[PDB]
Write a protein that binds this ligand. Structure first.
Ligand SMILES: [Zn+2]
Length: 135
């Protein structure tokens, strides 16, 4: 994490702490940014590192914000995840290790990757004016 664990517990909503710090998943189809179509950048809620640009976002129908690639190779950390009786690849913020979601091999071209990401893990910075909203 970029801030102290004390600052996070006091500034994060219960859902945002659960997702980013406790490896939780926000309920499917409830994320604030699920159907956002505005131009801008999705940053890590915790440390504000850029993670995904709006141009890579698409409507997968899977339950959560979906992107086909991150802004850079080093932006994301990949971990084997056996939670929930499944075998998946967990994605975390490469800078602060906040939990983001998972990556799947069923995405569109060119990557063929679906980056499944909790709205609660993201801060969206609007390309029109720099206005920021927490997911
Ligand atoms: Zn981060």
């Amino acid at each position: 994490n970029k801030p102290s664990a004390e600052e996070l517990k006091k500034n994060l909503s219960e859902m945002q702490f659960y997702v980013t710090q406790n490896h939780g998943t926000e309920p499917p189809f409830t994320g604030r940014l699920l159907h956002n179509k505005r131009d801008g950048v999705y940053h890590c809620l915790i440390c504000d590192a850029p993670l995904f640009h709006s141009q890579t976002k698409y409507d997968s129908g899977c339950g959560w914000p979906s992107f086909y690639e991150p802004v850079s190779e080093e932006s994301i950390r990949y971990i084997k995840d056996l939670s929930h009786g499944m075998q998946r690849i967990e994605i975390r913020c490469g800078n602060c290790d906040a939990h983001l979601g998972h990556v799947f091999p069923d995405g569109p071209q060119p990557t063929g990757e679906r980056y499944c990401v909790n709205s609660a893990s993201l801060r969206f910075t609007d390309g029109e004016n720099g206005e920021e909203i927490n997911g």
